[PDB]
């Protein structure tokens, strides 16, 4: 299915580039840091405009109006308030950092284990079986592109956890044993494939008196037809 | 059985910076204005904080696009899990191991408390399409769409996922179902006896009951 | 609101109606799809004792 | 807490006053100049009305179909708008899929996509 | 805290639960099988077999 396959790639990436130029809220979680720090500093920044109890919030009309005995206590005032405004603001910073410094500790985890590797971790490289992924740079973030597979199409198929040949039971070395309704196949569990049963296909363990469910078919041996 | 414990959510409270500084006093609130934004920024950060905590709960619940639901016929090859089912004679569907845990774990200062968006109805209704995904579809329906397998099937993935061979479960099916069954009773016995089983939870409220109680008594 | 020009050219009554109010706490003239909080309710006296 | 009343030594209670914080409701002014009010921890007493556990909503039409939640307001309800105005309701947590499940039927996939 | 103790959580849901660990002691001690949530106040608890 490689022409397939690539079909569906090359259109799932065009599909990306529709939404991601058209909605602006895609990238949210990014715009939503810059804008936290752009209160933070309008905030910080409007806070000189407050008199935290003094005469003025503008320090040179308190000193161009009253001598020391008296500026003083009024300056006291500002720096008082100015200072617990850059402690709040010191302590809002240090705290969002940590919150950026945890989002880039899992950036750089998926980077290494989801970019330059393939994850077996379920929904960590996005909803699906995951293939591979591209990064993509973003104001001060990653952006990542993950390639998933996942199930599109399904048949209801009876089943059974074991087929008897000749008393012996015989479980797949992969996938399941499936039925059609009038013969038995043995199938990988991800994609319907159906193979004939045979010695090669399953191994025997135990026999049918102990397996719950064990169905009666045959098992195709390929050497018996060559001696 | 083992069982594994995590916080998600903390109350969201929500402080009215005015109204607790300066409550219903005209003379009091014309001087903290000259405060700036710090009254401002305060109720901003709480605000913060109460949002997040449904994001928190979302992340872990809201994992699946479908609620799913059990067959009429608990069939799962000797696995009883009627336990960990939700249980339909009661008020809220939750199951009885989750009523245990229900069981354990426990004004006018402009101190308020706010609703979570997922009441404990709606948390149960995704813990139930969670388990009854895992149930009847085993991973794939966190993959994609909810394909059904036979349980003694499923346990034979899970089992080869753990490099033992498929047959061992098949064989000793019964044995496993009940050692499973028996796991399942001994949780309960545990959970419905030792207070302490839920502490990580118990801790949360009580370190916010405090900080609470901490913020009230600073009135005085 | 202040133009280039330093004309005041619109303006918010804050107590106009609730989207006044939220015009105002979010300084702003146009409001975000969400729910803001703006206010708190209260009770007034009626009479002295 | 409580006084005695200094003429008749009757005791009673001191309650303050109704109060709760109020949040609005509303759809972007891109779209609509139309918003709901919410007194949050309040009853539909002393404040088109719709009585929430959260509080007293007002303006928003109370409906009985589930949507997937778009504005949340609390304990389980949401609001939107639609067919337009403000409306209110219980939030789905997704559509109702049963599975077919049984002890010898397994769902197979045939086909597949690469999303 | 909690921020990372949900995300903890979110993370056991979608590895744990939904799928089959392969990571060592992350869903508890042993050879993980398959995991069941269960509700609690402010939190989830994980049965993992
Ligand atoms: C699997 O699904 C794909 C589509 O996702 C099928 O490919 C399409 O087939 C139709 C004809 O029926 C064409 O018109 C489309 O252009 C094809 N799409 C692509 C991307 O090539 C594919 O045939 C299906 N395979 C099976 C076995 O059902
Ligand atoms: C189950 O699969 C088998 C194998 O494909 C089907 O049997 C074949 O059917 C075709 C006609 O479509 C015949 O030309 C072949 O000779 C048959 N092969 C054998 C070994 O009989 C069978 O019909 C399928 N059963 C159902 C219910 O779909
Ligand atoms: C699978 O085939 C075997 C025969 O190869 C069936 O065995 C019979 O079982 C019944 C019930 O115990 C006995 O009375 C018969 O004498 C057995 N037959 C023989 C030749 O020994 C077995 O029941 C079949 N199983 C299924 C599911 O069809
Ligand atoms: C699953 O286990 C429960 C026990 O937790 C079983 O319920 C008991 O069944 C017996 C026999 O009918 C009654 O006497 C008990 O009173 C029941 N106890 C409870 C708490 O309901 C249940 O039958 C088992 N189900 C399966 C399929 O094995
Ligand atoms: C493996 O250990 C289990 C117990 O954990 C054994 O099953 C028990 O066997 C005794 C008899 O010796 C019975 O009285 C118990 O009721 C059984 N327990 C259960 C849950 O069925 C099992 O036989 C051992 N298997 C091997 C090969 O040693
Ligand atoms: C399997 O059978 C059930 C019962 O008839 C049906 O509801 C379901 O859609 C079928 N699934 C598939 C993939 O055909
Ligand atoms: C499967 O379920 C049916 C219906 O209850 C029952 O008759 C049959 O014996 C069961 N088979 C197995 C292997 O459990
Ligand atoms: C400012 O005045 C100039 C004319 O000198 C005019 O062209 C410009 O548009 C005005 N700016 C605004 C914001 O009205
Ligand atoms: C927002 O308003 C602009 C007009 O200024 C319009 O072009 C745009 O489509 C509107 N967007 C939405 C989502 O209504
Ligand atoms: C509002 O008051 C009525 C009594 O008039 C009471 O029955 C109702 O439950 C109250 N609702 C709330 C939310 O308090
Ligand atoms: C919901 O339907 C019931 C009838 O079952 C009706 O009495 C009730 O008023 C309806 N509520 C709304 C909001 O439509």
């Not at chain 1, 290494?112 to 993509?136: A, I, N, T, W």
């Not at chain 2, 579809?137 to 490099?163: C, D, H, K, V």
């Not at chain 4, 759809?27 to 709901?36: E, F, I, K, L, R």
Request: proline share 4%.
């Amino acid at each position: 299915n490689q022409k397939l396959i690539a079909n569906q790639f090359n259109s799932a990436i065009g599909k990306i580039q529709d939404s991601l130029s058209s909605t602006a809220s895609a990238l949210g979680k990014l715009q939503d840091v810059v804008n936290q720090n752009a209160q933070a500093l309008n905030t910080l920044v409007k806070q000189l405009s407050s008199n935290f109890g003094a005469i003025s919030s503008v320090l040179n009309d308190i000193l161009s109006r009253l001598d020391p005995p008296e500026a003083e206590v009024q300056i006291d005032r500002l720096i008082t308030g100015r200072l617990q405004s850059l402690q709040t603001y010191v302590t809002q910073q240090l705290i969002r950092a940590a919150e950026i410094r945890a989002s880039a500790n899992l950036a750089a985890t998926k980077m290494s284990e989801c970019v330059l590797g393939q994850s077996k971790r379920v929904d960590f490289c996005g909803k699906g079986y995951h293939l591979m992924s591209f990064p993509q740079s973003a104001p001060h973030g990653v952006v990542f592109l993950h390639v998933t597979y996942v199930p599109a199409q399904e048949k209801n198929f009876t089943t059974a956890p074991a087929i008897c040949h000749d008393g012996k039971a015989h479980f797949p070395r992969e996938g399941v044993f499936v039925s059609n309704g009038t013969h038995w196949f043995v199938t990988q569990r991800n994609f319907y494939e159906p193979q004939i049963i045979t010695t090669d296909n399953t191994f025997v363990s135990g026999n049918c008196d102990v397996v719950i469910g064990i169905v009666n078919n045959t098992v195709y041996d390929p050497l018996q037809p060559e001696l | 059985v083992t069982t594994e414990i995590l916080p998600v959510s903390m109350t969201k409270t929500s402080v009215d910076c005015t109204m607790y500084i300066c409550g219903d006093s005209t003379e009091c609130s014309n001087l903290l204005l000259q405060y700036g934004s710090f009254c401002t920024q305060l109720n901003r950060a709480l605000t913060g904080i109460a949002v997040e905590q449904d994001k928190n709960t979302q992340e872990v619940f809201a994992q699946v696009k479908q609620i799913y639901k059990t067959p009429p016929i608990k069939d799962f090859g000797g696995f009883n899990f009627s336990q960990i089912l939700p249980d339909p004679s009661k008020p809220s569907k939750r199951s009885f191991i989750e009523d245990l845990l229900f069981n354990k774990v426990t004004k006018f200062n402009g101190l308020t408390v706010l609703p979570p968006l997922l009441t404990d109805e709606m948390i149960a209704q995704y813990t139930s399409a969670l388990l009854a995904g895992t149930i009847t579809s085993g991973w794939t329906f966190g993959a994609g769409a909810a394909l059904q397998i036979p349980f003694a099937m499923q346990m034979a993935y899970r089992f080869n996922g753990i490099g033992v061979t498929q047959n061992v479960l098949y064989e000793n099916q019964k044995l496993i179902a009940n050692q499973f069954n028996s796991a399942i009773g001994k949780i309960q016995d545990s959970l419905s006896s030792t207070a302490s089983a839920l502490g990580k939870l118990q801790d949360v409220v009580n370190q916010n009951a405090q900080a609470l109680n901490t913020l009230v008594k600073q009135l005085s | 609101k202040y133009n280039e020009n330093g004309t005041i050219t619109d303006a918010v009554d804050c107590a106009l109606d609730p989207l006044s109010e939220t015009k105002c706490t979010l300084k702003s003239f146009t409001v975000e799809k969400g729910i803001y909080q703006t206010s708190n309710f209260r009770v007034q006296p009626t009479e002295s004792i | 807490d409580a006084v005695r009343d200094p003429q008749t030594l009757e005791i009673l209670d001191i309650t303050p006053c109704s109060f709760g914080g109020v949040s609005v409701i509303t759809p972007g002014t891109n779209t609509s100049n139309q918003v709901a009010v919410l007194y949050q921890d309040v009853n539909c007493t002393e404040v088109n009305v719709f009585q929430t556990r959260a509080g007293c909503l007002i303006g928003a039409e109370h409906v009985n179909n589930s949507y997937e939640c778009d504005i949340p307001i609390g304990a389980g309800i949401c609001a939107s708008y639609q067919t337009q105005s403000i409306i209110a309701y219980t939030m789905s947590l997704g559509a109702e899929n049963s599975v077919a499940y049984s002890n010898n039927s397994i769902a197979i996939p045939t086909n597949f996509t690469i999303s």
